[PDB]
Write an enzyme that holds these catalytic residues in place. Structure first.
Site, PDB file in Angstrom:
ATOM      1  N   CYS A 130      -1.003   1.451  -3.714  1.00 14.01           N
ATOM      2  CA  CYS A 130      -2.047   2.457  -3.572  1.00 14.01           C
ATOM      3  C   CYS A 130      -1.491   3.878  -3.561  1.00 14.01           C
ATOM      4  N   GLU A 175     -25.997  13.442  -8.956  1.00 17.86           N
ATOM      5  CA  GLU A 175     -27.472  13.440  -8.938  1.00 17.86           C
ATOM      6  C   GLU A 175     -28.062  12.522  -9.968  1.00 17.86           C
ATOM      7  N   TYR A 185      -7.027  -4.068 -13.696  1.00 17.51           N
ATOM      8  CA  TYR A 185      -6.989  -2.658 -13.270  1.00 17.51           C
ATOM      9  C   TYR A 185      -5.592  -2.092 -13.197  1.00 17.51           C
ATOM     10  N   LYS A 221       0.884   5.060  -6.533  1.00 17.40           N
ATOM     11  CA  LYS A 221      -0.001   5.058  -7.732  1.00 17.40           C
ATOM     12  C   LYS A 221      -0.863   6.295  -7.709  1.00 17.40           C
ATOM     13  N   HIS A 261     -27.683  19.572  -7.175  1.00 21.20           N
ATOM     14  CA  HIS A 261     -27.517  20.167  -8.484  1.00 21.20           C
ATOM     15  C   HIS A 261     -26.580  21.361  -8.420  1.00 21.20           C
ATOM     16  N   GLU A 272      -4.451   1.242 -15.194  1.00 18.05           N
ATOM     17  CA  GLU A 272      -3.995   2.427 -14.490  1.00 18.05           C
ATOM     18  C   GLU A 272      -2.606   2.816 -14.966  1.00 18.05           C
ATOM     19  N   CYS A 276       0.830  -1.189   0.000  1.00 17.59           N
ATOM     20  CA  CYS A 276       0.000   0.000   0.000  1.00 17.59           C
ATOM     21  C   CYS A 276       0.881   1.262   0.000  1.00 17.59           C
TER      22      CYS A 276
HETATM   23  C1  LIG Z   1       0.377  -1.126  -8.342  1.00 17.68           C
HETATM   24  C2  LIG Z   1      -0.694  -1.457  -7.307  1.00 17.68           C
HETATM   25  C3  LIG Z   1      -1.807  -0.578  -7.125  1.00 17.68           C
HETATM   26  C4  LIG Z   1      -2.810  -0.818  -6.200  1.00 17.68           C
HETATM   27  N1  LIG Z   1      -3.884   0.033  -6.096  1.00 17.68           N
HETATM   28  C5  LIG Z   1      -4.754  -0.151  -5.046  1.00 17.68           C
HETATM   29  C6  LIG Z   1      -5.749   0.781  -4.788  1.00 17.68           C
HETATM   30  O1  LIG Z   1      -5.839   1.901  -5.405  1.00 17.68           O
HETATM   31  N2  LIG Z   1      -6.612   0.566  -3.756  1.00 17.68           N
HETATM   32  C7  LIG Z   1      -6.585  -0.660  -3.014  1.00 17.68           C
HETATM   33  O2  LIG Z   1      -7.403  -0.760  -2.096  1.00 17.68           O
HETATM   34  N3  LIG Z   1      -5.643  -1.557  -3.292  1.00 17.68           N
HETATM   35  C8  LIG Z   1      -4.749  -1.325  -4.288  1.00 17.68           C
HETATM   36  N4  LIG Z   1      -3.736  -2.226  -4.432  1.00 17.68           N
HETATM   37  C9  LIG Z   1      -3.777  -3.450  -3.631  1.00 17.68           C
HETATM   38  C10 LIG Z   1      -3.225  -3.235  -2.208  1.00 17.68           C
HETATM   39  O3  LIG Z   1      -1.972  -2.562  -2.278  1.00 17.68           O
HETATM   40  C11 LIG Z   1      -2.970  -4.626  -1.558  1.00 17.68           C
HETATM   41  O4  LIG Z   1      -4.273  -5.309  -1.640  1.00 17.68           O
HETATM   42  C12 LIG Z   1      -2.617  -4.551  -0.091  1.00 17.68           C
HETATM   43  O5  LIG Z   1      -1.356  -3.791   0.027  1.00 17.68           O
HETATM   44  C13 LIG Z   1      -2.310  -5.908   0.428  1.00 17.68           C
HETATM   45  O6  LIG Z   1      -1.955  -5.799   1.861  1.00 17.68           O
HETATM   46  P1  LIG Z   1      -1.378  -7.066   2.601  1.00 17.68           P
HETATM   47  O7  LIG Z   1      -1.282  -6.691   4.026  1.00 17.68           O
HETATM   48  O8  LIG Z   1      -2.075  -8.312   2.181  1.00 17.68           O
HETATM   49  O9  LIG Z   1       0.078  -7.259   1.992  1.00 17.68           O
HETATM   50  P2  LIG Z   1       1.357  -6.325   1.763  1.00 17.68           P
HETATM   51  O10 LIG Z   1       1.042  -4.891   1.932  1.00 17.68           O
HETATM   52  O11 LIG Z   1       1.940  -6.767   0.483  1.00 17.68           O
HETATM   53  O12 LIG Z   1       2.251  -6.554   3.047  1.00 17.68           O
HETATM   54  C14 LIG Z   1       2.968  -7.783   3.214  1.00 17.68           C
HETATM   55  C15 LIG Z   1       4.227  -7.411   3.986  1.00 17.68           C
HETATM   56  O13 LIG Z   1       4.829  -8.701   4.369  1.00 17.68           O
HETATM   57  C16 LIG Z   1       6.279  -8.503   4.271  1.00 17.68           C
HETATM   58  N5  LIG Z   1       6.820  -9.881   4.236  1.00 17.68           N
HETATM   59  C17 LIG Z   1       6.518 -10.826   3.280  1.00 17.68           C
HETATM   60  N6  LIG Z   1       6.955 -12.041   3.641  1.00 17.68           N
HETATM   61  C18 LIG Z   1       7.554 -11.851   4.885  1.00 17.68           C
HETATM   62  C19 LIG Z   1       8.201 -12.772   5.770  1.00 17.68           C
HETATM   63  N7  LIG Z   1       8.239 -14.059   5.624  1.00 17.68           N
HETATM   64  N8  LIG Z   1       8.696 -12.212   6.924  1.00 17.68           N
HETATM   65  C20 LIG Z   1       8.576 -10.860   7.160  1.00 17.68           C
HETATM   66  N9  LIG Z   1       7.985  -9.970   6.384  1.00 17.68           N
HETATM   67  C21 LIG Z   1       7.533 -10.503   5.252  1.00 17.68           C
HETATM   68  C22 LIG Z   1       6.463  -7.708   3.020  1.00 17.68           C
HETATM   69  O14 LIG Z   1       7.740  -7.103   2.977  1.00 17.68           O
HETATM   70  C23 LIG Z   1       5.280  -6.675   3.160  1.00 17.68           C
HETATM   71  O15 LIG Z   1       5.647  -5.451   3.763  1.00 17.68           O
HETATM   72  C24 LIG Z   1      -2.666  -1.977  -5.372  1.00 17.68           C
HETATM   73  C25 LIG Z   1      -1.566  -2.771  -5.487  1.00 17.68           C
HETATM   74  C26 LIG Z   1      -0.574  -2.563  -6.465  1.00 17.68           C
HETATM   75  C27 LIG Z   1       0.608  -3.466  -6.568  1.00 17.68           C
HETATM   76  C1  LIG Z   2     -26.544  32.846  -8.179  1.00 17.35           C
HETATM   77  C2  LIG Z   2     -27.403  31.642  -7.803  1.00 17.35           C
HETATM   78  C3  LIG Z   2     -26.794  30.361  -7.617  1.00 17.35           C
HETATM   79  C4  LIG Z   2     -27.516  29.228  -7.281  1.00 17.35           C
HETATM   80  N1  LIG Z   2     -26.878  28.029  -7.067  1.00 17.35           N
HETATM   81  C5  LIG Z   2     -27.655  26.904  -6.914  1.00 17.35           C
HETATM   82  C6  LIG Z   2     -27.067  25.647  -6.874  1.00 17.35           C
HETATM   83  O1  LIG Z   2     -25.821  25.447  -7.101  1.00 17.35           O
HETATM   84  N2  LIG Z   2     -27.853  24.549  -6.700  1.00 17.35           N
HETATM   85  C7  LIG Z   2     -29.256  24.680  -6.436  1.00 17.35           C
HETATM   86  O2  LIG Z   2     -29.885  23.628  -6.297  1.00 17.35           O
HETATM   87  N3  LIG Z   2     -29.800  25.893  -6.449  1.00 17.35           N
HETATM   88  C8  LIG Z   2     -29.028  26.989  -6.671  1.00 17.35           C
HETATM   89  N4  LIG Z   2     -29.670  28.184  -6.798  1.00 17.35           N
HETATM   90  C9  LIG Z   2     -31.106  28.232  -6.519  1.00 17.35           C
HETATM   91  C10 LIG Z   2     -31.951  27.785  -7.729  1.00 17.35           C
HETATM   92  O3  LIG Z   2     -31.506  28.463  -8.899  1.00 17.35           O
HETATM   93  C11 LIG Z   2     -33.430  28.200  -7.484  1.00 17.35           C
HETATM   94  O4  LIG Z   2     -33.776  27.572  -6.197  1.00 17.35           O
HETATM   95  C12 LIG Z   2     -34.392  27.641  -8.506  1.00 17.35           C
HETATM   96  O5  LIG Z   2     -34.011  28.188  -9.824  1.00 17.35           O
HETATM   97  C13 LIG Z   2     -35.762  28.152  -8.248  1.00 17.35           C
HETATM   98  O6  LIG Z   2     -36.676  27.598  -9.272  1.00 17.35           O
HETATM   99  P1  LIG Z   2     -38.150  28.151  -9.357  1.00 17.35           P
HETATM  100  O7  LIG Z   2     -38.843  27.301 -10.345  1.00 17.35           O
HETATM  101  O8  LIG Z   2     -38.728  28.382  -8.005  1.00 17.35           O
HETATM  102  O9  LIG Z   2     -37.994  29.628  -9.926  1.00 17.35           O
HETATM  103  P2  LIG Z   2     -37.252  30.302 -11.174  1.00 17.35           P
HETATM  104  O10 LIG Z   2     -36.289  29.384 -11.816  1.00 17.35           O
HETATM  105  O11 LIG Z   2     -36.760  31.601 -10.680  1.00 17.35           O
HETATM  106  O12 LIG Z   2     -38.355  30.364 -12.304  1.00 17.35           O
HETATM  107  C14 LIG Z   2     -39.426  31.312 -12.213  1.00 17.35           C
HETATM  108  C15 LIG Z   2     -39.771  31.668 -13.654  1.00 17.35           C
HETATM  109  O13 LIG Z   2     -41.024  32.440 -13.561  1.00 17.35           O
HETATM  110  C16 LIG Z   2     -40.924  33.475 -14.596  1.00 17.35           C
HETATM  111  N5  LIG Z   2     -41.954  34.464 -14.203  1.00 17.35           N
HETATM  112  C17 LIG Z   2     -41.980  35.148 -13.007  1.00 17.35           C
HETATM  113  N6  LIG Z   2     -43.150  35.780 -12.833  1.00 17.35           N
HETATM  114  C18 LIG Z   2     -43.895  35.473 -13.970  1.00 17.35           C
HETATM  115  C19 LIG Z   2     -45.218  35.856 -14.360  1.00 17.35           C
HETATM  116  N7  LIG Z   2     -46.069  36.496 -13.621  1.00 17.35           N
HETATM  117  N8  LIG Z   2     -45.624  35.367 -15.580  1.00 17.35           N
HETATM  118  C20 LIG Z   2     -44.781  34.591 -16.345  1.00 17.35           C
HETATM  119  N9  LIG Z   2     -43.559  34.203 -16.030  1.00 17.35           N
HETATM  120  C21 LIG Z   2     -43.152  34.701 -14.865  1.00 17.35           C
HETATM  121  C22 LIG Z   2     -39.511  33.951 -14.512  1.00 17.35           C
HETATM  122  O14 LIG Z   2     -39.136  34.661 -15.676  1.00 17.35           O
HETATM  123  C23 LIG Z   2     -38.755  32.578 -14.339  1.00 17.35           C
HETATM  124  O15 LIG Z   2     -38.292  32.015 -15.550  1.00 17.35           O
HETATM  125  C24 LIG Z   2     -28.937  29.371  -7.176  1.00 17.35           C
HETATM  126  C25 LIG Z   2     -29.527  30.570  -7.434  1.00 17.35           C
HETATM  127  C26 LIG Z   2     -28.792  31.737  -7.718  1.00 17.35           C
HETATM  128  C27 LIG Z   2     -29.477  33.036  -7.978  1.00 17.35           C
HETATM  129  S1  LIG Z   3      -1.356   2.930   2.493  1.00 17.10           S
HETATM  130  C1  LIG Z   3      -1.448   2.502   4.313  1.00 17.10           C
HETATM  131  C2  LIG Z   3      -2.838   2.082   4.748  1.00 17.10           C
HETATM  132  N1  LIG Z   3      -3.765   3.142   5.214  1.00 17.10           N
HETATM  133  C3  LIG Z   3      -5.123   3.079   4.926  1.00 17.10           C
HETATM  134  O1  LIG Z   3      -5.561   2.227   4.169  1.00 17.10           O
HETATM  135  C4  LIG Z   3      -5.951   4.069   5.637  1.00 17.10           C
HETATM  136  C5  LIG Z   3      -6.740   3.302   6.721  1.00 17.10           C
HETATM  137  C6  LIG Z   3      -7.793   4.084   7.386  1.00 17.10           C
HETATM  138  N2  LIG Z   3      -7.236   5.249   8.101  1.00 17.10           N
HETATM  139  C7  LIG Z   3      -8.549   3.209   8.424  1.00 17.10           C
HETATM  140  O2  LIG Z   3      -9.176   2.216   8.045  1.00 17.10           O
HETATM  141  O3  LIG Z   3      -8.457   3.531   9.637  1.00 17.10           O
HETATM  142  C8  LIG Z   3      -2.624   1.026   5.852  1.00 17.10           C
HETATM  143  O4  LIG Z   3      -1.961   0.030   5.486  1.00 17.10           O
HETATM  144  N3  LIG Z   3      -3.084   1.183   7.018  1.00 17.10           N
HETATM  145  C9  LIG Z   3      -2.876   0.197   8.135  1.00 17.10           C
HETATM  146  C10 LIG Z   3      -3.432   0.899   9.464  1.00 17.10           C
HETATM  147  O5  LIG Z   3      -3.137   0.305  10.531  1.00 17.10           O
HETATM  148  O6  LIG Z   3      -4.120   1.910   9.255  1.00 17.10           O
END
Ligand SMILES: Cc1cc2nc3c(=O)[nH]c(=O)nc-3n(C[C@H](O)[C@H](O)[C@H](O)COP(=O)(O)OP(=O)(O)OC[C@H]3O[C@@H](n4cnc5c(N)ncnc54)[C@H](O)[C@@H]3O)c2cc1C
Ligand SMILES: Cc1cc2nc3c(=O)[nH]c(=O)nc-3n(C[C@H](O)[C@H](O)[C@H](O)COP(=O)(O)OP(=O)(O)OC[C@H]3O[C@@H](n4cnc5c(N)ncnc54)[C@H](O)[C@@H]3O)c2cc1C
Ligand SMILES: *SC[C@H](NC(=O)CC[C@H](N)C(=O)O)C(=O)NCC(=O)O
Ligand SMILES: *SC[C@H](NC(=O)CC[C@H](N)C(=O)O)C(=O)NCC(=O)O
Ligand SMILES: N[C@@H](CCC(=O)N[C@@H](CS)C(=O)NCC(=O)O)C(=O)O
Ligand SMILES: N[C@@H](CCC(=O)N[C@@H](CS)C(=O)NCC(=O)O)C(=O)O
Lengths: 462, 462
Positions: free
Chosen positions: A47, A456, A181, A50, A451, A185, A42
């Site tokens: 992880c 959504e 995967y 990567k 939105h 990646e 990891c």
């Molecule tokens: C390129 C890559 C990308 C990945 N991407 C992700 C991801 O995005 N998300 C995800 O969830 N998983 C991902 N994985 C998978 C994740 O890393 C592994 O599933 C996880 O690390 C496995 O944990 P583990 O404890 O089984 O083994 P490991 O982490 O492999 O730990 C085993 C440890 O045992 C030690 N060891 C081995 N044999 C002995 C021995 N006999 N005595 C003492 N020490 C020893 C090793 O040195 C090692 O430190 C990825 C893995 C790879 C390779």
């Molecule tokens: C800057 C800004 C950012 C926002 N960001 C978000 C956001 O990220 N996410 C979110 O969910 N909401 C956001 N909102 C809120 C969201 O836009 C409004 O809650 C939503 O548009 C209201 O819809 P409504 O149908 O009540 O009214 P409106 O969309 O205002 O429609 C009313 C319509 O009635 C028409 N009208 C009015 N009076 C008459 C009349 N007597 N006869 C004919 N037509 C008339 C108007 O011309 C208009 O087209 C934002 C709003 C603003 C101003």
């Molecule tokens: S890449 C090291 C790993 N960390 C995580 O996966 C985060 C774990 C979360 N914080 C959680 O579940 O608590 C890892 O190997 N962690 C081992 C550990 O003891 O957290």
């Protein structure tokens, strides 16, 4: 002499760290054995690095839009060394944090390689010193797979994800082999950052285990971003050339004849073809601990091995290879063993996944086809949409958002959610909580939309 | 002569459009009256153009990080006209889409200003022609408030959000008056895009109706981004000067003496001090339709006015002034009237909100203090975290993420979620579905995390 603990954890990665820390909270006298760097895959080669590289790629892709958003263009080449150094520093900070987390919890750190001994009472040896406990957790993870030379001569000239994190410069020409995967990646990062990138896949699409909509969309998005997807293609041989490598490829598209192609002047050949568990040198046979033919430790639903007092979690078991899965299984195990909660275990259903493609993918639950198999075709209904996020209303470059909800039975229980699009990386977690709770489509439609967002769209499907 | 319909909708904004379209699906013979542009506030002077401008601001802020991520810096000035033109084109595309949505649904569009007549049977007149229906929906929205000259001489020299969307150039110096979400959003956009910006607020913090953690954090983030927050400050007078305006301000901080300050050389003074409903010219008195002292139409829980066969939804009623609220109330009303579903109504509890600050804010449910009032102090538990997102691991610029979960009773029902941070805009929707379903903290903690994301922090609080 043999030192005794309540809990011995082999491996200091996600699963071992989390299980040891929770056991110590419950009073266990615990130790973690680690042969390399705390944080495991990891922190060091997975992880975290990567994600840093994904953020770097994402930034680059968006800056392609800078003129469209009213700014003078950013005509500038990327410097891989800058981010490599910063990434490595972050990894080092994390290594220090996890060491401290163990120390502050009074968990002993045993530095070295553990193996079991033949003592009937389960015991490990590390650097010639022996340790025992009534509870031993194997959490040793895995490593990348590479082809054998007998199969693919020259395969050792390629690298894996481990080598990716050692690269000190951007490869000019990259060929990524694989369709899962990690392959997706790595190809997307290398291409975004300017490598001339190909992704070589055995069939027509990437991510074939994901819902069909995601597999199709991800493949299309890769191609639209400039990744050359080499379909129905396999490496036969690799040779060193004066410039990089030459990859010999065989392509065999259905309905066409097989063809051999040489790919010249390849700087980076990256094998992303699977993972192998780290069990070969554990001496599991000394205690008869059961493995599959690939080396995975076999466990039951409670993470028990076939040997009393020995457990396994995480990648070494081969199931759901994600960091949070290792962590949750490790924590649930600690409550079972040290809080005596006999039903404490991880539910492996409805685990959410994000793939850090461009744009990212989120999925939880069943694919449409899995739901049809489980519930019957007459008892599954899907709802879907496709749209262009409003981020791109003003840009010449485009990405799509696709979303699919899979519903089962008369009540339309939401049994799967699948999406790809801007924001999907941060959007999924909350939907996964709803799915885990048994949400129906009515529960989604009863929630007022936010939105303008992409999110959504999931609560307004009809 | 009088034309009869099943449903007459006054206003073609979010609420009116949505209610008319759903009624037509159910077979109603409907008409929409619109005096200006279809899409209302949402499309023309609200949600949509605001979001385009937020995306523009967000892009700018991130590009401040371009060198940290390994690219040659983007030393380039913004050109407001470029994005203004593109924004206006998008608005025009949306106007055309909503016109077509009505036409395709066979909803008549009546162009002009509606007012009620004195006919005992409710009837409206538009351009000298009369129209009647057994069901008439008032969905006329609102407009920005501006101070009266008798109170604040020169206030007419300022603009409102409407004028913001008419600006053809970036103001060099901006003063935004207000402390609600519109004021916050406008100040953050203008500052990000390069205006020397002040936000003048009556007390110490913005967003005082939000959870205290959000109010504090949002204020701090504004200041850290370079917005000058003028606390305990009010405008006394505005005068035109050779350069822009001079704003006369009074500042009265508790524990200090009041002081008068002139703010010179102001290019844009933006009043963001509230909204007034659009009811003055409707001739509501001809039918005795009830309003409050501010002009809002009074309704019951089913959107009924005090007059049979007349309803109101959206901003004209003054409650929960959001686009999805107008839409949902309008759709629920259509099912009540035209599907005969007597219990069909909008639940105004647990409506989620996003504020497009930098970083964005998401909230759903009760603030901590509202929950303490409702449930009792001994019956509320909060969980919170604060962290730096890993996006900033490699950057010199920083933003924080803060999250708060508010839980009630022994079961720790999640009654509020409050956050600010990167991704929170897309993260909230799914959590709102869980909250609406009655999720407990155990439901969150039973959901496996997605790593590495910000969103996982909400399912791993302890
Ligand atoms: C390129 C890559 C990308 C990945 N991407 C992700 C991801 O995005 N998300 C995800 O969830 N998983 C991902 N994985 C998978 C994740 O890393 C592994 O599933 C996880 O690390 C496995 O944990 P583990 O404890 O089984 O083994 P490991 O982490 O492999 O730990 C085993 C440890 O045992 C030690 N060891 C081995 N044999 C002995 C021995 N006999 N005595 C003492 N020490 C020893 C090793 O040195 C090692 O430190 C990825 C893995 C790879 C390779
Ligand atoms: C800057 C800004 C950012 C926002 N960001 C978000 C956001 O990220 N996410 C979110 O969910 N909401 C956001 N909102 C809120 C969201 O836009 C409004 O809650 C939503 O548009 C209201 O819809 P409504 O149908 O009540 O009214 P409106 O969309 O205002 O429609 C009313 C319509 O009635 C028409 N009208 C009015 N009076 C008459 C009349 N007597 N006869 C004919 N037509 C008339 C108007 O011309 C208009 O087209 C934002 C709003 C603003 C101003
Ligand atoms: S890449 C090291 C790993 N960390 C995580 O996966 C985060 C774990 C979360 N914080 C959680 O579940 O608590 C890892 O190997 N962690 C081992 C550990 O003891 O957290
Ligand atoms: S800015 C125009 C508004 N659109 C939305 O809020 C999106 C609505 C969703 N697609 C949905 O709930 O279906 C708007 O005013 N829409 C009115 C309409 O009839 O969609
Ligand atoms: N809701 C989506 C689609 C855009 C839309 O509603 N129009 C977004 O905000 O991108
Ligand atoms: N999970 C958060 C915090 C980082 C962390 O887990 N370390 C993120 O990904 O930013």
């Amino acid at each position: 002499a043999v030192a005794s603990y309540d809990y011995l954890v082999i491996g200091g990665g996600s699963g071992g760290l989390a299980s040891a820390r929770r056991a110590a909270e419950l009073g266990a006298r615990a130790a973690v054995v680690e042969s390399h760097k705390l944080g495991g895959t990891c922190v060091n080669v997975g992880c975290v690095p990567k994600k840093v590289m994904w953020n770097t790629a994402v930034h680059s892709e968006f800056m392609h839009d800078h003129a469209d958003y009213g700014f003078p263009s950013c005509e500038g080449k990327f410097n891989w060394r800058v981010i490599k150094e910063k990434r490595d520093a972050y990894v080092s900070r994390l290594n220090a944090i996890y060491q401290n987390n163990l120390t502050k919890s009074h968990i002993e750190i045993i530095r070295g390689h553990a193996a079991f001994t033949s003592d009937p009472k389960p015991t490990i040896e590390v650097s010639g010193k022996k340790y025992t406990a009534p509870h031993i957790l194997i959490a040793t993870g895995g490593m990348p797979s590479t082809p054998h030379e007998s199969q693919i001569p020259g395969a050792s000239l390629g690298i894996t994800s481990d080598g990716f994190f050692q690269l000190e410069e951007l490869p000019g020409r990259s060929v990524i082999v694989g369709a899962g995967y990690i392959a997706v990646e790595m190809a997307g990062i290398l291409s975004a950052l300017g490598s001339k990138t190909s992704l070589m896949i055995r069939h027509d699409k990437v991510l074939r285990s994901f819902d069909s909509m995601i597999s199709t969309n991800c493949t299309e998005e890769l191609e639209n971003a400039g990744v050359e997807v080499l379909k129905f293609s396999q490496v036969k041989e690799v040779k060193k050339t004066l410039s990089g490598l030459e990859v010999s490829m065989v392509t065999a598209v259905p309905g066409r004849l097989p063809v051999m192609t040489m790919i010249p002047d390849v700087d980076c050949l990256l094998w992303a073809i699977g993972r192998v568990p780290n069990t070969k040198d554990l001496s599991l046979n000394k205690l008869g601990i059961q493995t599959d033919d690939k080396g995975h430790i076999i466990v039951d639903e409670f993470q028990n091995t076939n040997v009393k007092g020995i457990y396994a979690v995480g990648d070494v078991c081969g199931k759901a290879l994600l960091t949070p899965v290792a962590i949750a299984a490790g924590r649930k195990l600690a409550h079972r063993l040290f809080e005596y909660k006999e039903d404490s275990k991880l539910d492996y259903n409805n685990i959410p996944t994000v793939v850090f493609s461009h744009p990212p993918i989120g999925t939880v639950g069943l694919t449409e086809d899995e739901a049809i198999h489980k519930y019957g075709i007459e008892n599954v209904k899907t709802y879907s949409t496709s749209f262009t996020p409003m981020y791109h209303a003003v840009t010449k470059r485009k990405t799509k958002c696709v979303m699919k909800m899979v519903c089962a039975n008369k009540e339309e229980k939401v049994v799967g959610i699948h999406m790809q699009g801007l924001g999907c990386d941060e959007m999924l977690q909350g939907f996964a909580v709803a799915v885990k709770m048994g949400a129906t489509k009515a529960d989604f439609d009863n929630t007022v939309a936010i939105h303008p967002t992409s999110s959504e769209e999931l609560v307004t499907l009809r």
